[PDB]
Design a protein around this ligand. Structure first.
Ligand SMILES: Nc1nc2c(ncn2[C@@H]2O[C@H](COP(=O)(O)OP(=O)(O)O)[C@@H](O)[C@H]2O)c(=O)[nH]1
Ligand SMILES: [Cl-]
Ligand SMILES: [Cl-]
Ligand SMILES: [Zn+2]
Ligand SMILES: [Zn+2]
Lengths: 364, 351
């Protein structure tokens, strides 16, 4: 019945997923007497909301029209979306889900019911929830959504005994990582990897599939915040990661006394044993409005995040190669000497990416 | 049009994939005036062929009918002519030295054709076609590991990384393999039985396999230094056991135990020659359950045709035992990936 318009609405909402952070993905569909007369989605932060975009396009035809929104309309003064709907005289509003704030939820929808509008909530809620896993987790929990990525060979190895980790996964796999990088609020790495590989960890618009490039105009490329974990300030100001377009954040235990570019700032995290308290680092990040973190780490940091229980999702790319028994493993799990204490997961989705396969796992 | 019948005979042909060895899988459908009056598939080696099974079904109605066979008829060719049939359709030619069977019909007034769903027919006897073409069996390497390619821990536990669902899947893949190969190293560590357990076959597969009809795959143990003893489980089981020895053991073994003498090469057993001799013994397909040392050795020899990988959603750590030991340093391609319980199974062919 209504499912076509909402589905269209969430498809519209996904158009903003590369540039919407720290705001979520929202799409608006306005139908009057069975004909769409308004469409919009949120694109950047501080820019016009989705419902406003669609009301501005619908104009006079919004009177007595139904509005499909992927979330509860903004209910607080930019002037709030919930009142703009009233100003335009929409007679019916369908929202896929409510606000994630524990108290603010339902406020907007009530205000329309108080002003005589038809309101309902929950239609395609699960699809709406999946569009904003990071934001919703940060709005409910203090913590962001964490994506641990791993790219290995069939036998679980990430680099040969020579250290040649240079491109064991497929070029299609690298394009797939670029897409998932591009919609990530932030990218996280350890100093162990920075010293070993001296990486860029920047979203390279060139190596993006053209389907995405048709939705991501290059001039609006948002470079995700780069977070480097350096509890002992081993990274130097001459490493590639810091002299890159976009901003770099260093999780340090004490301030480094050298001079750094303006696009580099330092976050001080308290210490646990000999290093940062990783959970606390995730906490402060949540307090700074970071929705989702894409983790590009070697075996050490991957083992840490798992052993701390900070991983919400495992993304594993497997290449159809056998890389030998003496090649570097996937993650370092100290004290794991019996397999009953091994970490346990659940396969959500398995998909083909060129000659590779990509495995999506959840903790439980 | 006639593809609908070839597909029927292919489905029939698969019905004996469990008991057919060393013979291939073949199905036959005879249609006359739009009705399949004859059906059959080969079931057991030494039992009647499929074309005969189908001709016995069609009887007098076989006259002036059309035969769809998944492989060129063998002889099965004469009973075809003796039954008065025109227009034989064959999925593929025989990989034996070949088209003689088609000639016996081409020049005897019968119409012929070749190639209909040829790829699907070739997929149903991967071992038999390879052996008839190269003299070598089709080699399936099974691997079951955690998410980080780990089998067992540094202690050597390995105790149920894979699901019970994945074990039952293995038994299904074991039960259609001609033979099952392992190394002495695995025999000494686990004292395994390496038997197809009808009790461990999922009810989907048990529908096909009747319990009283169970054909145990030939068991092959590579024991190049004769370290397995006749007290081990594997020799005290139903069916034959073949030992790939380098020099003949002098002990007394059960009647079902026999040895195969393989030339050495640079002090170790020559795996390539072993396969070559095993083809002479008519072994179509080999299911390989092996630890890191044997598995890498087959791969490095280039003898692995197919990888079967079960992955469990666990991590064992980077110091736990790996999958294949590759001294000196293999490329594949994913054919089928599928879910088996909480694990996934990946099917890879040499690429
Ligand atoms: N300073 C720093 N910290 C790291 C690096 N790699 C990982 N980490 C973090 O610091 C710890 C590294 O592991 P380790 O010092 O042996 O402690 P463990 O993880 O508790 O065994 C983990 O908690 C990681 O989260 C690195 O290169 N530099
Ligand atoms: Cl990079
Ligand atoms: Cl067993
Ligand atoms: Zn709003
Ligand atoms: Zn025959």
């Amino acid at each position: 019945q209504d499912e076509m318009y909402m589905a269209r609405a969430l498809k519209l909402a996904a158009r903003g997923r590369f540039t919407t952070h720290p705001n979520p993905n929202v799409g608006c569909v306005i139908v009057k007497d069975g004909e769409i007369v308004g469409e919009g989605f949120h694109y950047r932060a501080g820019e016009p909301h989705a419902e406003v975009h669609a009301l501005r396009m619908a104009g006079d035809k919004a009177k007595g029209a139904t509005a499909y929104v992927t979330l509860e309309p903004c209910s607080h003064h930019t002037p709030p979306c919930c009142d703009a709907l009233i100003a335009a005289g929409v007679a019916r509003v369908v929202a896929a889900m409510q606000d994630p704030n524990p108290q603010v939820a339902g406020r907007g929808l009530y205000r329309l019911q108080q002003a005589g509008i038809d309101v309902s909530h929950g239609l395609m809620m699960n699809e709406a929830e999946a569009l904003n896993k990071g934001f919703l987790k940060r709005m409910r929990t203090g913590f962001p959504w964490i994506q641990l990525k791993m790219g290995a060979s069939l036998d679980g190895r990430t680099a040969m005994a020579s250290g040649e980790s240079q491109w064991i996964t497929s070029p299609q796999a690298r394009r797939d990582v670029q897409r998932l990088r591009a919609q990530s609020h932030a990218i996280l790495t350890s100093s162990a990897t920075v010293l070993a590989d001296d990486p860029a960890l920047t979203v390279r618009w060139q190596e993006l599939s053209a389907d995405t490039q048709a939705l991501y105009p290059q001039e609006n490329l948002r470079q995700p915040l780069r977070i480097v974990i350096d509890s002992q300030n081993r990274v130097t100001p001459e490493h590639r990661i810091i002299q890159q377009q976009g901003e770099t954040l260093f999780a340090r235990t004490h301030a480094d006394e050298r001079a750094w570019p303006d696009n580099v700032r330092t976050l001080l995290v308290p210490e646990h044993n000999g290093h940062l308290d990783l959970v606390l680092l995730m906490m402060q990040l949540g307090k700074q409005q970071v929705n989702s973190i894409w983790v590009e780490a070697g075996p050490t940091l991957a083992g840490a995040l798992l052993q701390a229980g900070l991983v919400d999702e495992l993304i594993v790319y497997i290449a159809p190669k056998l890389l030998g028994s003496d090649a570097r493993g996937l993650c370092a799990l100290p004290g794991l000497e019996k397999l009953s204490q091994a970490p346990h997961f659940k396969f959500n989705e398995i998909r083909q990416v060129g000659p590779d396969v990509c495995l999506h796992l959840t903790t439980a």
